[PDB]
Structure 1
Amino acid sequence: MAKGNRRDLLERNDIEVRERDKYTVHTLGKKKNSVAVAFVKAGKGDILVNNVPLALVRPEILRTKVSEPIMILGESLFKGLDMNIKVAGGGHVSQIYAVRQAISRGVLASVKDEAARSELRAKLVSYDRQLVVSDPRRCEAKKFGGRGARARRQKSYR
C-alpha cells in the first residue's frame, strides 16, 4: 500500500509539529523498494519501528539482525539517544535490512567528532559493508519471448 517516496513519509508528518522540531538528525536506509526514515534525538535509549519496539519485530529470527550494531558498537551511545523509525516498501526482510542500515547511519551522524566517526566506520564496516552502503541490485524487466527475464518458451523442432 505504501510507496516509499511519498512526501508524507520523508518529512514524517506523522509526528506532531511541536515534537517534530526536537528531532535534529535525519537518516535513510533502503533495500529493494523498501525505504526507512529515522528521526534521532536525545534521550535515554529507546527505539521504535512503526510504533513498535525493536524486541517485537515480527519475523522473529532476524531480531538479532536488527540488533547487530548495538552489540557491535556497544550500548553506551544508544543508551544516550532515542530514535523513532518508520519504514514502507516491499517485503519483511527488505524492511529489516533497511532498518538496520538506517540505525547505523543515524548513530554515525550523531557524533560530531569526525575522527571517532571514521574509527566507528572502520570498526563496523569490517564486520559487514551493507550496514553503511546500500545494496544496488534491483528487480529486472522481462521480455516477450517467454515468461521470464532470461528464460524462454520451450521449442519443439519436430
Structure 2
Amino acid sequence: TVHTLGKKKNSVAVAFVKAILVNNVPLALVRPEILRTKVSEPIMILGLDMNIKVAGGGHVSQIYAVRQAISRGVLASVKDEAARSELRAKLVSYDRQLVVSDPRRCEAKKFGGRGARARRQKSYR
C-alpha cells in the first residue's frame, strides 16, 4: 500500500504502489508516442506494480502528472536513508519539477478585452 499524487494544470493523478498501468493502457501505449520518452525519463535515469488514475485538463498535463507521480511513488520506496536522500538529488539535477508541482494557473479575464492583457483597439477618429 502506497499513495501518491501528481498535478499539472487541472490534471490529477492517483497512484497506488505495491510490492504498469495508466488509465488501463500500459506505459508505452499512452497516446502521445512522441512524449512517451518524456514519461519514461525517470524510470531509465534512476520494479514494483504501480497503478494510476489521472484526469483533468489536457494531454501534456496528463503526462506531467503521471510522470511526477511515478517519481514520487518510487522516491517513497526506501525510507530514512542516503538513497532516500540522493534519489531526489538526481531528480533535481534532471529537473526540479520532478518533485515539486508547477504552481502556474490561468489568470482571469477582465472586461474590455479577449484575455488577461489584450485590450481592444483605441480609435480617436
Deviation at 1:113, TM superposition (A): 3.6
Encode CA deviations 1:17-74: one digit per residue, 9 max, x unaligned: xxxxxxx1100100100010000001xxxx1001110010101100001100011009
Q: Distance in 2 between matches of 1:110 and 1:120?
A: 10
Q: Secondary structure of the residue that 2:26 maps to in structure 1?
A: coil
**Who is 1:153 aligned against?**
120
Which of residues 65, 79, 83 is equivalent to 1:112? 79
- How many residues of Structure 1 are paired with residues of Structure 2 in the alignment? 125
Q: TM-score, normalised by structure 1?
A: 0.76
Q: As a proportion of its length, which structure holds more strand?
A: 2
State the 4+ residue runs in structure 1 displaced beyond 4 angstroms: none
Deviation at 1:145, TM superposition (A): 1.3
Q: Distance in 1 between matches of 2:72 and 2:89?
A: 13
Deviation at 1:122, TM superposition (A): 0.8
Q: Quick check: 1:49 aligned with 2:22?
A: yes
Gaps of at least 5 residues in structure 1 are 1-23, 75-80
Q: Distance in 2 between matches of 1:103 and 1:138?
A: 23
**Who is 1:94 aligned against?**
61
Q: Distance in 2 between matches of 1:113 and 1:73?
A: 18
Which of residues 18, 29, 38 is equivalent to 2:6? 29
Q: Distance in 1 between matches of 2:81 and 2:107?
A: 38
State the Cα RMSD in Å. Answer: 1.2
Q: Secondary structure of the residue that 2:41 maps to in structure 1?
A: helix
Identity of matched residues, % = 100
Q: Distance in 1 between matches of 2:115 and 2:79?
A: 49
Gaps of at least 5 residues in structure 2 are none
